[PDB]
């Protein structure tokens, strides 16, 4: 009975994440937890100049999802 469960389906796609801190993060998602803690693969995060990180992982403001992803199919259990 949570919208979090939908994010566990999301795995594999790339997203630019914004945080409360005010950073921006392009990278592929590997896994998503019930407590929102996401782990990313092949990341390019910017705080300062942008710096690439391999394995990046409360602070999440919003995910800007890719345009190809069908919402109707994922919103079902």
């Amino acid at each position: 009975m949570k919208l979090v469960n939908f994010l566990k389906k999301l795995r594999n796609e790339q997203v630019t994440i914004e945080l409360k801190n005010g950073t921006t993060v392009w990278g592929t998602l590997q896994s998503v937890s019930p407590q929102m803690n996401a782990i990313l693969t092949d990341v390019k995060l910017t705080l300062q100049q942008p710096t690439a990180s391999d394995n990046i992982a409360n602070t999440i403001r919003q995910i800007i999802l890719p345009d190809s992803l069908n919402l109707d199919s994922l919103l079902v259990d």
Partner: protein, 90 residues
């Protein structure tokens, strides 16, 4: 148990009402950057999946500059939301 009861009667019902009506919404954020879009799905924490979003936010360089950007799909964590305005087209 009691969560089912409040979705029909309470404050959150007007999103369920609006989002089912295929409605657009104006949302005031905690970032000082308002969000104007149409909603897909919501939750008890106000975790909302938005579609076709457009922001409105001032700036300085200096004088006030407004800037807009279109986003296709957007999962918003309800902590960032401070005020929701559920405005109908009709």
């Amino acid at each position: 148990e009691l969560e089912e009861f409040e979705f029909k009667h309470g404050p959150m019902s007007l999103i369920n009402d609006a989002m089912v009506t295929r409605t657009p919404v104006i949302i005031s954020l905690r970032n000082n950057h308002k969000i104007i879009a149409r909603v897909k799905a919501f939750d008890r924490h106000c975790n909302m999946v938005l579609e076709n979003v457009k922001e409105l936010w001032t700036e300085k360089k200096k004088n006030v500059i407004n800037r807009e950007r279109f986003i296709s799909k957007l999962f918003l964590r309800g902590d960032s939301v401070i005020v929701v305005l559920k405005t109908p087209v009709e």
